[PDB]
């Protein structure tokens, strides 16, 4: 009976979770500077 | 006194691995194949958390 | 990568896992493991130690499940156990030695 | 619109037995000490392993002796 800490390494999968639905580099909104 | 992996006592957990079958009190095994004939005790059972 | 347990967990050994506690009186004394390198293994190979974890202890409890029967074969079964012929003995599947 | 009418009969059903173990008679909103939460009776929270653990402090210092190779 307690805890365990798994840290932050702890990956139960692999891939995209969060706007998965994406190519590779699809840019979010942002402003150039130049 | 939980149960491995959910709020399932020690207490209802005994029962039914020998309510059935001959195994609980001679120690500690694990049930044979034969045994869980299609959804028998263990079969459809499967414990989660999230 | 926090998650409060309660996990049940049995002893393997070569002699102490199939055998009869008697009457009387007994002392447990036994040491476990306290680090996540010796104890879990990653599906990647890496080490749970330089990546910021720990593993914590509150409370332990040794638990035992009991042979219910009337209490006269319950000490007449163990007296016949208690002879210098008639006792306990146990081997393993792998009771063989190991050498590197 | 009328649902019930006014002198309702009560010594009818049969009264027995209660179980005294958490919450058997009333949905009352019972508090919990400095770290854990309210539960109601009738809740569906209340089948889980509704818990309360975390401490850390000790897992990031331990790691950290690694620093020179």
Same mark, same amino acid.
């Given at each position: ?11 139960? *999968?692999?891939?995209?979770? *969060? ?16 | &006194?939980?149960? #491995? ?13 020998? #309510? ?8 500690? &095994? ?8 299609? &959804? ?11 | ?35 996540? $390198? ?12 330089? !990546? ?31 002879? !210098? ?12 030695? $190991?050498?590197? | ?12 059903? %049969? ?11 009333? @949905? ?10 309210? %539960?109601?009776? @009738? ?12 401490? %850390?402090?000790? +897992? ?7 620093? +020179?190779?």
């Amino acid at each position: 009976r307690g805890v365990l800490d798994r840290g932050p390494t702890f990956k139960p *999968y692999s891939g995209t979770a *969060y706007n998965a639905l994406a190519p590779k580099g699809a840019p979010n909104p942002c402003e150039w500077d130049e | &006194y939980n149960v #491995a992996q959910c709020n399932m006592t020690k207490d209802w957990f005994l029962v039914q691995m020998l #309510a059935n079958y001959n195994i609980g009190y001679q120690g500690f &095994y694990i049930p044979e194949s034969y045994k869980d004939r299609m &959804y028998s005790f263990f079969r459809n059972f499967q414990p989660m958390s999230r | 990568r926090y998650v409060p347990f309660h996990i049940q967990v049995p002893q393997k050994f070569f002699a102490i896992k199939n055998l009869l506690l008697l009457p009387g009186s007994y002392t447990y004394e036994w040491n476990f493991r306290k680090d996540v $390198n010796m104890v879990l293994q990653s599906s990647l190979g890496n080490d749970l130690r330089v !990546d910021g974890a720990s593993i914590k202890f509150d409370s332990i409890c040794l638990y035992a499940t009991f042979f219910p029967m009337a209490h006269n074969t319950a000490s007449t079964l163990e007296a016949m156990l208690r002879n !210098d012929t008639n006792d306990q003995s146990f081997n393993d599947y792998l009771s063989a030695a $190991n050498m590197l | 619109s009328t649902n019930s009418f006014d002198g309702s009969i009560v010594s009818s059903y %049969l009264t027995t037995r209660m179980p005294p173990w958490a919450g058997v008679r009333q @949905n009352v909103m019972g508090s919990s000490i400095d770290g854990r939460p309210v %539960l109601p009776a @009738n809740s569906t929270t209340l089948t889980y392993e509704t818990v309360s653990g975390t401490p %850390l402090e000790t +897992a990031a210092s331990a790691a950290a002796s690694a620093a +020179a190779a």
